[model samples]
Target: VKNSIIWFRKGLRLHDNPALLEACKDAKHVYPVFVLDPHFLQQKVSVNRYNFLLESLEDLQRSFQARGSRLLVLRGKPEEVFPRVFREWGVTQLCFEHDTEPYAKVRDAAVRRLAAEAGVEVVTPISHTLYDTDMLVARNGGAAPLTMQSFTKLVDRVGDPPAPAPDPPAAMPPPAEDMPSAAPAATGVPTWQEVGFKEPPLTVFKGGETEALARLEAAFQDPKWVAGFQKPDTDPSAWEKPATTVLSPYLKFGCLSARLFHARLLEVYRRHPAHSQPPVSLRGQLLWREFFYTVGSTTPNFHRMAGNPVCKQIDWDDNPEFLAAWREARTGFPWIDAIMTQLVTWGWMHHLARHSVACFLTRGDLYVSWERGMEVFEEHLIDQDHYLNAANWMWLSASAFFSQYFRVYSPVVFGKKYDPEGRFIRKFLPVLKDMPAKYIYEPWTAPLEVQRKAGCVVGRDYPAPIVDHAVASKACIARMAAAYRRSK
Candidate 1:
């Protein structure tokens, strides 16, 4: 077949996709391919995130079929899979989107080398974040910002990104001759069982290109979510749930192109009247993601503690008990436990929770390494990216690209500040639900006899505060401050 192969990576959408649209330029055929990387399967991915990825892939297939094309599902390392496909199809050119993770960079390099040996041209484009990494990095003038405040200013200067080209007409090329054998047509959706999921009665967030588009449209129509993103630490009300454009899942799956999402938001921002402040506040966040992507792309060796100069000398604790308690959410801290439980139940937690819990583990609990905490977040957060996850954790532990601020979060103070009145705590921690609203925040403080009468027994029915909050809080501050000074 006289066609190019469109290998879908994180980018799964049909609209505003440079690779798909560019490949479709010729009358020749196009093959949409998706390979499930083995590393992903080997990692301990959370059920919620795994399910979301499968759902998005299924949706991408359906969208392709609607356009007279089909998605070929394969399992294997890309280096092995691509050569096999080339031999069968005699592919003249290979086109696909890109991923910014270190593993992905290594994987892409191997694939490119293999393709070059086979005389096949390989092309790639950005697909994950709303702003392209290069643009943000350049506008920030080669040096990346250590703080989000500085990054946000860079965004204001660059202005909004351009909108995507109109959707291409539905036209597909034939399967490449010697075309590798096709697996059974995957009906565009996988039963949770087929994808190795714990069966029914699950309500994960929506996945797939169609669903992503619908969400984008709704957010563009009413930028309340995007407009209200500035107060990430605000109370959790219907109007206050991390309001800045809940398109992270779509971005993760490539169901919605970052460029496309950015363009739409910009278009809306341009068109909205003065009364409609236009949710432009999220523009800063998009820039932040962009900043991180560029930093990751350029450094690549950051997670291993290779590139940064200051990040190498920091010290950490190696307490197994502390690590285990934090991992199991048995730290005897309701705020930490609540956040972990929230992640398990919803597969999502606010940025504040991540910071608070991370600080407690590294600073308060005096743990050395943050790998355990990162693993937990990686398994559960669908939006997990190497740079953000590592940077966030290390920042708390006082180890990273920049100097660390060793401020410990008192779970008690945080509960009172963010959850305020134990509403969030009560929502996620059911055992404490029966306790009086006032006592819910500190059930351990209740009279021992009253606690017994209420069927609430600390260290028995409910876990007791494993460590004294006051003592732990003080110890955390002392350890972090000492570590930061020693490292500097």
Candidate 2:
């Protein structure tokens, strides 16, 4: 009765962690548990992503250990596992941060039911997003705010998030001694092999609150850059050192709290008067993330086109060969292929690069289902958030969120505009390294003399362009026009 268990899910950090703060306050002995649900792990995940997760767990374990507590990681379904913890740990209270992903909703409901039957007090707090999404929907007459303006207005009514939960205490109470002896020993974080993954090459981005907060601090050091930050102005081709603050992966995993990021950005902006405002400014980027979360939470089947009212139904191409080429980074468009290569090797991509690839898959060229693209992203992106991924794919595909199906990204012209010298392409597509800047983007167009000079013949070295962009773009626009009229 004097004990509690903090169910650690997405909110992995100790600072501004509402559930951890509350759990420690109410009980003399607190146990923090992270359930690695078999259901989630079984799904295909990038090796790099799994490694990042394992690193975060290791970091979390160290933090808890420093605070006189342990992060008890269990491998199983939560509904079945929590009941045992309730009885064995003598848990009088259950606390956790709320998660809005579709599967999380179902899992949380079942856990709450178990807690009720066991008479354990359940305390679920809003720590993931800036504001409670359900409250935002309720404010909009039970409809999700579909546009940026509507979302910001609703947020204005709710006011700022309760000042982020205070930093966790230096020392937490020890776990109850009577914990079930049968429970697996708290073995700290598991290795990649233990969790069904081979160790992968080190990613450019590491995990944990330590890394997340450090990046935030570094961003502020260049307050001018932070103040003048505009999403559109950032260079997607500058992968060596990205132009934008690459805090998305941290945000996705809840390592960096959204409210904390917003408050910090506002604080700096107040001091620096020339800062840009929302919808394009650094703060505006956070709002875009929140927008997708709100939309995805309210709309069922947001990840798929079937049974979803918001997404437009279109007759997509059933070209398996094209899809395979796109996935394998053999699409023959150096820019698109390079982006895909970065996604698999690094598990992250610049936003504009993502726009180009997603556009090519649906509207710009292939006219394949956005769902197929979403699946590939889910597997590789270190920051593959459920709602954000679904919403963005729809936006790029012109299925929802955006509606300029006729306006497509020219893979050739777009990349040339960003990195005219083809640095990004050459970095990922080594075969194109010696190709001239003019022909780097369009290898097939290079004359035989030019190809020989570069020592990379088109067809012999790199595959030619998979589809003619001009022809494909026009056909895709015509098909989308038809789909739009049918929907009306």
Maximum-lDDT candidate = 2
Which residue runs of candidate 1 sit more than 4 Å off their true CA positions? Answer: 37-43, 130-159, 174-180, 185-192, 195-203, 236-244, 271-280, 305-307, 310-312, 400-407
Q: Model 2, range 1-488, lDDT digits (tens) per residue?
A: 46888888898788888888789885788888888764555646877887777777888988888987777888777888888878887778999999988888899999999999999999999989988888888888989888898788888788876667789878998786545632446435777776666665456898988899999898889888888998898899998888888888888888889989988888889898989977889988998988998888888898899988889888888889989999999998899999999988998998999999999999889999999999999999999999889899999989897997878889999988879999999998887899889888888988999999898987887888899998999999999999989988
Score every model by TM-score. Answer: 0.87, 0.96
**What is candidate 2's CA lDDT for residue 83?**
89
How many clashes does each candidate structure show, in the order listed? 6, 0
What is the C-alpha local distance difference test score of each model?
0.68, 0.86
lDDT by residue (1-488, candidate 1, tens digit) is 34677887777777877777667766376777877753554446766777777777778777777777777877777888888777676667788787777677788899889889888777786556656677677777786666666766766687666567568676666454344355455313454566555644243577788888887787766655444445453443222345345677777667777777667556555654432332235555566567666666666456655456435544566778877777777766667788877777677666667777887777666554776678877877876777777766766666764454545667777667645667677677777776776667677888888778768788888787778877876776676677766755
Clashes of 1: 6
